[PDB]
Design a protein around this ligand. Sequence first.
Ligand SMILES: Nc1ncnc2c1ncn2[C@@H]1O[C@H](COP(=O)(O)OP(=O)(O)OP(=O)(O)O)[C@@H](O)[C@H]1O
Ligand SMILES: Nc1ncnc2c1ncn2[C@@H]1O[C@H](COP(=O)(O)OP(=O)(O)OP(=O)(O)O)[C@@H](O)[C@H]1O
Ligand SMILES: [Mg+2]
Ligand SMILES: [Mg+2]
Ligand SMILES: [Zn+2]
Ligand SMILES: [Zn+2]
Lengths: 398, 398
Amino acid sequence: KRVTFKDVGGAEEAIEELKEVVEFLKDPSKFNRIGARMPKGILLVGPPGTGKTLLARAVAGEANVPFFHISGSDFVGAARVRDLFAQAKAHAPSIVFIDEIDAVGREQTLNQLLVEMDGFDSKEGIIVMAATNRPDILDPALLRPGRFDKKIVVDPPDMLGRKKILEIHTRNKPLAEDVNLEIIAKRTPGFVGADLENLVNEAALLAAREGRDKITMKDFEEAIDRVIAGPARKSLLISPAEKRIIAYHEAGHAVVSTVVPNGEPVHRISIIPRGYKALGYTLHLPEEDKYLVSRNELLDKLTALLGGRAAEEVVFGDVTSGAANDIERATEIARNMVSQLGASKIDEEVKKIVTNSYERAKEIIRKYRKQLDNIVEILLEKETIEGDELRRILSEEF
Amino acid sequence: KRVTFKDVGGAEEAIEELKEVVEFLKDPSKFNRIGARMPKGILLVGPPGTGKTLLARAVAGEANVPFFHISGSDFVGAARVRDLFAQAKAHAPSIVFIDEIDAVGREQTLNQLLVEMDGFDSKEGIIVMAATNRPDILDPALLRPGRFDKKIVVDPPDMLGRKKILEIHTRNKPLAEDVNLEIIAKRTPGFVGADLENLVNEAALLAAREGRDKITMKDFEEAIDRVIAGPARKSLLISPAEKRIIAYHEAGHAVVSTVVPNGEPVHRISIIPRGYKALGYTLHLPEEDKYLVSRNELLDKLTALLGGRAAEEVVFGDVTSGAANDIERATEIARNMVSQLGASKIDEEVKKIVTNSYERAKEIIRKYRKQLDNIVEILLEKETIEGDELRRILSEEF
Ligand SMILES: Nc1ncnc2c1ncn2[C@@H]1O[C@H](COP(=O)(O)OP(=O)(O)OP(=O)(O)O)[C@@H](O)[C@H]1O
Ligand SMILES: Nc1ncnc2c1ncn2[C@@H]1O[C@H](COP(=O)(O)OP(=O)(O)OP(=O)(O)O)[C@@H](O)[C@H]1O
Ligand SMILES: [Mg+2]
Ligand SMILES: [Mg+2]
Ligand SMILES: [Zn+2]
Ligand SMILES: [Zn+2]
């Protein structure tokens, strides 16, 4: 089946990134005449079910060109790679797509892929795309210049994103007049596009089982219960009790950052992760992102990184998996600080730095408990605060 | 012989699940006109003698369609699978049934089955069904999307279920006026439908041996003794001494869950198992069923999982097979907790977590011994507590 960008919801930034690829595929001479050099490979990274394959297929739909694809889960291997690149060259304007590249990137197939990347001319309109959900186990040889060197992140949808996906999959189905898709979206936090597609099918089976020719509001609400429990369950959602722990953890990061003099400005607070760091990816990038290394700015960074864990212990006396990851990162930063700012005595010094920074964050939480509570109440009602509203809220408080 | 849903007793939930299949088989256009997509395969799981084959045969009776079936115990193999699917297509509205699929799911027959599943069109009213009592040894390739992906559980009958089965098999036999089928049902805990069918035949042989033309009450009571002992025995039943150990084990789970702050609500307590977890099935599903991983909720889950074993040691000083399984599951959860919340030193940490949780459960049992005794007395008289009665009982106590 053929798809375009009208079949994708909640991926505005990725579509903005891929507009350039579409334009290049439509007419390469415009890029060639001014000496603009396009990348040879593009990598898509994201959690399962977020729609990487759908985006790859929709890119070819917008600019109608041949689409040659292979899957890494099906891996004679070196000969199959050779044939794929030969078809693309005979139809110069086209796309080559490799799905699940982590399953193959045994050593003969990888070597053949590197030979093919260096052997084709990009000026005639050939691009290579790949997708994965385990980017941190890829061979470093694939990420050198002249190879896959552009990365695009795909994120789970928010409330307004979930509503758009529901409308895409119900435009060919008859609905009653009591159906409110906005209410349904508010009751499925944590769902991804694949989960929402399965939910619509379940509601249609309940109506057909009774002979009705329309789907009603109660069909949708009963379908939610059937997909989260039982011998055949497919989806997970965030319950109201779990929502309170997550809200306090996110607010703890923002409060501590605003108080320390060297902290970074806060632009968005949400219950759903959005960044590549929030998803737990390093992407083979150095941890240090500053030109200058100084003691005061490193200590402030450590204290803010422990704000989420400090809020959990002071309010609930508990610890989550996210908090355990945060203290693992902080130990790596402290180890690098000791060797740059001045075997068993080194460990004692690292343990002292982390312990002191954790106590500092806990005393900030206690002093600003009233401000922390106010942010949590607003977050539990809208699920996301950003833009001018966040600026005003942070100014009225503090 | 032809059967329908009137020949099945004590399987209300399975019949509710299969009503949709019956409706689809009767008229596919109603499902097609609104875009409702039916599953391609359905799997039935349960202990031997519970009536999986009977349910499969009764599905075809309610919607009179051709019924093509094969048995896995009779396994040239690839050619027999090819012929079975060819007959169904020529009679589009029909059923294909594979019995004892674990005996075959040597590698050529399995490959042919996967080719047939992907080659037929579901929109014309074709469904595939299978049954097994060893679901945990099935090849994972059969459970992927587009293949067998819906599961239905069949459970042993309770007291009211046993009474219904006895009435089904005595409606064509002459009975005396002193026969009370309700009393007979109370004296056969642990029997399944196959056992009860054999019991009725035994009572009819005792009457015929004396030339009588009616079956009396004492014929039924003598038949029970003849099927549980001797060189030719067929059935097992729970004795009054064994009933007390089982009652204390089940009540131990419920008491501990109600006391810990993060425990789950209790809705039903019974002497007969009812769930797929209570039957010892994993069904290839992840153990973790929560969106968020936290320390406090994991420890509470571990303590409640050991409540049954703690009651046995404090009241009787004994251990059963069910208790041994419970402590085997708890060790797997503890191992995963250590690697997520923070080679020989890892084992010492796992052993410490399990030991601490077991001591916690034992001290709860001692403090609430009076409440534990009261629940056991009611359970030994009715065999099952649920609904509003359980809510009231749990509220008067505690
Ligand atoms: N943003 C979206 N809008 C609409 N449908 C979506 C979206 N994301 C996912 N889907 C639905 O999810 C279905 C399957 O997801 P898809 O295979 O595209 O995701 P993926 O990230 O490639 O998955 P995986 O990691 O499992 O390979 C698609 O057929 C599409 O119907
Ligand atoms: N719920 C029931 N109601 C009535 N009869 C039943 C019921 N369950 C089983 N039976 C009787 O059990 C007899 C044999 O059981 P059946 O073969 O249907 O069970 P099964 O689960 O397929 O067994 P197995 O695992 O041995 O293959 C059937 O002929 C039927 O008479
Ligand atoms: Mg994919
Ligand atoms: Mg059978
Ligand atoms: Zn955090
Ligand atoms: Zn138990």
